[PDB]
Amino acid sequence: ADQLTDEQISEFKEAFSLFDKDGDGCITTKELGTVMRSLGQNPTEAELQDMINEVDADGNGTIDFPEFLNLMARKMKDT
Numbered sequence: 094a095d096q097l098t099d100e101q102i103s104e105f106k107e108a109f110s111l112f113d114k115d116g117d118g119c120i121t122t123k124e125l126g127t128v129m130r131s132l133g134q135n136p137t138e139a140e141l142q143d144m145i146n147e148v149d150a151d152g153n154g155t156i157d158f159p160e161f162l163n164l165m166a167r168k169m170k171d172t
């Protein structure tokens with residue numbers, strides 16, 4: 094939104110690699126769940142898949158980095 098900056102990018106990137114326990118460049122529902130779980134959040138399994146599927150514009154069931162920018166870009170909706 095309003096053109097992303099370096100800080101919002103680098104911070105996003107660090108956040109994403111950070112979520113990648115294996116640093117394989119992919120976030121699975123388990124890793125995402127580890128985080129959501131640890132974040133006082135408790136999504137249902139179907140929900141995580143569905144949540145991923147909304148961003149899975151590609152259809153892989155996992156999150157890459159740009160897919161993660163979309164996810165966080167929409168999330169940052171907080172106007």
Ligand SMILES: [Ca+2]
Pocket residue numbers: 113114115116117118119120121124
């Ligand atoms: Ca992974």
Ligand SMILES: [Ca+2]
Pocket residue numbers: 148149150151152153154155156157160
């Ligand atoms: Ca995807």
